[PDB]
């Protein structure tokens, strides 16, 4: 809101690639053309730019796996922040968008209240009580990036509860966010229904190697018909994984 919305998208010190740099110059020009077009157009352009970066990476695929994971973590954080900031200036009610690369985004801007809310799209759906998004009108968003292989390749899965693991993501990286920043101690549990999936099936998220898949308290209610229902007590970038030992 203070015309510093796009200043966070910078390449971390140490990295040196000619594709990430061009992507960040593109987002800088996007911020330049953000006070003129529309909040509903800058968001679509951000999604399309992320799709361009993910679909055709240059020397990003030649980066070290820790550096790629750090890039992915920063990218997901920045995407959540930008989506919150842009949705803060949208008309009240649902906002749905599907990129040509099938990157699905849904939002729900509405007043504060304690009304049960169901929202989502094909790749992810949510069943939350609105008393947890209020923490101005509240925001609840779902950003599902289908292809995230290059940045998330050679990642490690840590369960924190408890040798070898053969990770294979089965669903899109569904990033969930609300208005309040403290997104790890939600009062009422959230119900998720992710798709595209289908020796174990887990609901794990991307926890800041610079990043690793972590379970950390997300009960898998069950899987059926290529869709797993997870009950989670926090909000992060969730993705179903197969944990072939």
């Amino acid at each position: 809101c203070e015309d510093m919305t796009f200043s966070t998208w910078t390449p971390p010190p140490g990295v040196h690639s000619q594709t990430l740099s061009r992507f960040f110059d593109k987002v800088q020009d996007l911020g330049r053309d953000s006070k003129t077009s529309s909040a509903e157009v800058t968001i679509q352009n951000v999604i399309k730019l992320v799709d361009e970066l993910m679909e055709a990476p240059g020397d990003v695929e030649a980066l070290a796996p820790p550096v790629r994971h750090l890039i992915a973590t920063q990218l997901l954080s920045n995407l959540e922040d930008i989506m919150r900031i842009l949705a803060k200036s949208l008309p009240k009610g649902p906002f749905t968008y599907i990129s040509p690369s099938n990157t699905e985004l849904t939002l729900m801007i509405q007043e504060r209240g304690d009304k049960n809310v169901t929202m989502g799209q094909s790749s992810a759906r949510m069943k939350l009580n609105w008393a947890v998004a209020a923490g101005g009108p509240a925001v609840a968003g779902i950003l599902s990036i289908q292809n995230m292989t290059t940045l998330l390749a050679n990642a490690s899965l840590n369960l924190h509860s408890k040798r070898g693991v053969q990770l294979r993501r089965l669903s899109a990286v569904n990033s969930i966010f609300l208005s309040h920043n403290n997104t790890k101690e939600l009062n009422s549990p959230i119900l998720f229904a992710f798709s595209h999936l289908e020796q174990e099936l887990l609901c794990a998220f991307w926890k800041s190697r610079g990043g690793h898949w972590a379970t950390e308290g997300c009960q898998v209610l069950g899987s059926k018909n290529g869709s797993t229902t997870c009950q989670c007590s926090h909000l992060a970038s969730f993705a179903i994984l197969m944990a072939h030992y």
């Epitope: 049960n116 169901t118 929202m119 989502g120 759906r125 069943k127 119900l191 229904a193 209610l221 069950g222 059926k224 018909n225 869709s227 229902t229």
Partner: antibody
């Protein structure tokens, strides 16, 4: 494929009787409910009756419970609707749909009794002329 | 019975415009509200069931949500074959009730 073909509709005088038939092909009616939905000319959709042949579970509307009788014969795999004591308010286009209990899709996400009419018929026209 | 109230009952849009139809319901139907589309002279076709789930074959541009007793159907980008009449239905409590119907017309 799944097809529902209605029949039996036509002209009728008030106070008369008319029996509608809805033949179901491509599936067995013994696992879904066969709703009957009418639509008055130029008006919105309106429920009329429902049937669950494996349970019986006859259910009717308010302006309908007194006269219409809905039956389903598993031998012929068709559902009927024996409309009677017809009035001028019953002129409409009657569709037969197939109620689909989608609970078994995601039993951890849906409720037991949720249903939706996924395959509709084509609609037979009933005219009540005085 | 649950009276399904619908708005605006008549909508004039264009190609590419986002279209939202509201189906606020009396009492409280939790999430079982389905959306149908009826082109003139044709039988209705199921679009969305359980207020958020897309039926098989429906384009992905259709989306739904629930906000208590308020159910909305949104179309991400309108297309020339999307101009028809839309109804919302509940089956939780007998009798099942349909919406009054919202008609979408070209601009």
């Amino acid at each position: 494929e799944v097809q529902l073909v209605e029949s039996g509709g036509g002209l009728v005088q008030p106070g008369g009787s008319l029996r509608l038939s809805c033949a179901a092909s491509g599936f067995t009616i013994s696992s879904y409910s066969i709703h009957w939905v009418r639509q008055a000319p130029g008006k919105g959709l309106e429920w009329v009756a429902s049937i669950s042949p494996y349970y019986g579970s006859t259910s009717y509307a308010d302006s309908v419970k007194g006269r219409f009788t809905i039956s389903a014969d598993t031998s012929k795999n068709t559902a009927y609707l024996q409309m009677n004591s017809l009035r001028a308010e019953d002129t409409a286009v009657y569709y037969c749909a197939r109620s689909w209990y989608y609970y078994e899709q995601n039993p951890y996400w849906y409720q037991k009794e949720e249903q939706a009419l996924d395959y509709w018929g084509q609609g037979t026209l009933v005219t009540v002329f005085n | 019975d649950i009276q399904m109230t619908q708005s605006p009952s008549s909508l004039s849009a264009s190609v590419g415009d986002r279209v939202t139809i509201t189906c606020r319901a009396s009492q409280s139907v939790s999430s079982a509200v389905a959306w149908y589309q009826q082109k003139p002279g044709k039988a209705p076709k199921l679009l969305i069931y359980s207020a958020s789930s897309l039926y098989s074959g429906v384009p992905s541009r259709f989306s739904g949500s629930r906000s208590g007793t308020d159910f909305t159907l949104t179309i991400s980008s309108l297309q020339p074959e999307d101009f028809a009449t839309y109804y919302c239905q509940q089956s939780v409590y007998s009798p099942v009730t349909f919406g009054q119907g919202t008609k979408v017309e070209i601009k």
